[PDB]
Write a protein that binds this ligand. Structure first.
Ligand SMILES: O=S(=O)(NC1CC1)c1c[nH]cn1
Length: 164
């Protein structure tokens, strides 16, 4: 069903994450972590304190798809075990902010062709697939986008609900 998912998404905030490669999304799915540049790190930390759920929706550049979505479970923190991200050319690990813990809600893919009817008011009402890394997605658009993903029957949202 979709009822616990809708509960998790109620009054949530949504952010588009545009990964340079599949390897970084694979690492995030395996380890339950994400790291971003300080400009986005600051936005996500502010959002984490402001809302019952902050949802990251992931898309690998040139894939034509989203790869899933996850909920922030912490603010960013430094000093963990290093994560061997595959960084964009011209970028060192020192340029990253801290590490966010995340709980995956859906690890299934959604092709952009299925989200063509959804536009993001916070990005000039362009299709929600369009946006820079860290673009906030307005509540209604973000909720409908998440509801379009195939259900991920491997995930039990009971655990996610208790952290809210
Ligand atoms: O270099 S990043 O700020 N973070 C990670 C490498 C994991 C980034 C690039 N594209 C989206 N986010």
């Amino acid at each position: 069903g979709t009822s616990k998912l809708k509960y998790v998404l109620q009054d949530a905030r949504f952010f588009l994450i545009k990964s340079n490669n599949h390897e970084n999304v694979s690492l995030a799915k395996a380890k339950g972590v994400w790291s971003t540049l300080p400009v986005n790190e600051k936005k996500l930390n502010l959002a984490f304190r402001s809302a019952r759920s902050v949802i990251l929706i992931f898309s690998v550049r040139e894939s034509g798809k989203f790869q899933g979505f996850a909920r922030l479970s912490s603010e960013s923190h430094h000093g963990g075990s290093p994560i061997h991200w595959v960084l964009p050319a011209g970028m060192s690990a020192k340029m990253l902010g801290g590490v966010f813990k995340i709980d995956w809600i859906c690890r299934r893919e959604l092709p952009f062709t299925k989200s063509a009817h959804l536009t993001n008011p916070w990005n000039e009402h362009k299709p929600v697939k369009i946006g820079r890394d860290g673009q906030e997605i307005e509540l209604e658009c973000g909720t409908q986008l998440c509801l379009l993903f195939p259900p991920d029957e491997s995930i039990d949202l009971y655990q996610v609900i208790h952290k809210m």
